[PDB]
Amino acid sequence: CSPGIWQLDCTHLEGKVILVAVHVASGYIEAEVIPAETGQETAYFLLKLAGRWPVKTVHTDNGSNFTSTTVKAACWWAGIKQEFGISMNKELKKIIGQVRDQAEHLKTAVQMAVFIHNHKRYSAGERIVDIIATDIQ
Amino acid sequence: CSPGIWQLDCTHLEGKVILVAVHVASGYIEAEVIPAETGQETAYFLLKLAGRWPVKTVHTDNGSNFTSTTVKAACWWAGIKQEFGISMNKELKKIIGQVRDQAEHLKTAVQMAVFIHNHKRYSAGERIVDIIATDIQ
Ligand SMILES: CCC1=CC2(C[C@H]3CCCC[C@@H]3C2)c2c1ccc(C)c2[C@H](OC(C)(C)C)C(=O)O
Ligand SMILES: CCC1=CC2(C[C@H]3CCCC[C@@H]3C2)c2c1ccc(C)c2[C@H](OC(C)(C)C)C(=O)O
């Protein structure tokens, strides 16, 4: 459970696409509703994630996602490698259903579920910080 | 320099709006190009930030930004208070100019500058994690 490994996958709900990144060692999640399942959307999300967390390698359950020239360039620029050493999408989907009524847009509902997921109990949010600070010291 | 304090401001470049959040104790930055300077854009950004970092209080140099019923609801939901105890927007603008040519869209350029800002040298990214893990332990 290395501190730099993330898993990226796209799931579907209400005819929309939700891109889910999981920090594998901690269970911490970053997720966003994207207009389309394209490389430009994937490339932009990776660039944003890498500027926020130390992202060393990325795994996926759909290898074809990392074929676009655009995603390769983002991984090139950010120094990210593909992971060769290797559920929550559904716990997230359960949390979204529980909070869907409180919000008009699904995107609002996804960020609320990401909040509840990462702050629920140590929390996934406390684990990622501990794991990364430990790796620093 | 409490670990839960963030400063949010909107800056302008190329006729677009960039929303910049600074973790005050560390100098770590989260920034995004938003289509418009509205409360719905501000409310969505706060909900996303709070699900990623422990956000206790938020300060701004434009108090009118926090007047919309929408932003108040996001702060209500996320348990965020307004800060009453209290530059980088320009170091970020310097980094964006240095990298603007490498990218077509300004939004791509902003995430690259956020990456360079947070990973430059201890780094702002290393400080925020240390500060928050220290506050946990
Ligand atoms: C008081 C008015 C109001 C509150 C919330 C703000 C949300 C903060 C988190 C809890 C739910 C709240 C619902 C909201 C409101 C008015 C319009 C919209 C379209 C939304 C939400 O959209 C955004 C977060 C703004 C992009 C949504 O999708 O409903
Ligand atoms: C090889 C093709 C290619 C690479 C980059 C991907 C970027 C990754 C980080 C360094 C610059 C790269 C430029 C790119 C490319 C093709 C089209 C666009 C429109 C973009 C960038 O847009 C997004 C990040 C995709 C939203 C941009 O705005 O140029």
Swiss-Prot record, chains A, B:
It is found in: Virion; Host nucleus; Host cytoplasm. Mg(2+) 3 binds at residues 9, 61. Homotetramer; may further associate as a homohexadecamer. Part of the pre-integration complex (PIC) which is composed of viral genome, matrix protein, Vpr and integrase. Interacts with human SMARCB1/INI1 and human PSIP1/LEDGF isoform 1. Interacts with human KPNA3; this interaction might play a role in nuclear import of the pre-integration complex. Interacts with human NUP153; this interaction might play a role in nuclear import of the pre-integration complex. The core domain contains the D-x(n)-D-x(35)-E motif, named for the phylogenetically conserved glutamic acid and aspartic acid residues and the invariant 35 amino acid spacing between the second and third acidic residues. Each acidic residue of the D,D(35)E motif is independently essential for the 3'-processing and strand transfer activities of purified integrase protein. The chain holds residues 1203 to 1356 of 1435 of the full protein. Catalyzes viral DNA integration into the host chromosome, by performing a series of DNA cutting and joining reactions. This enzyme activity takes place after virion entry into a cell and reverse transcription of the RNA genome in dsDNA. The first step in the integration process is 3' processing. This step requires a complex comprising the viral genome, matrix protein, Vpr and integrase. This complex is called the pre-integration complex (PIC). The integrase protein removes 2 nucleotides from each 3' end of the viral DNA, leaving recessed CA OH's at the 3' ends. This is Integrase. Residues 1-132 form the Integrase catalytic domain.
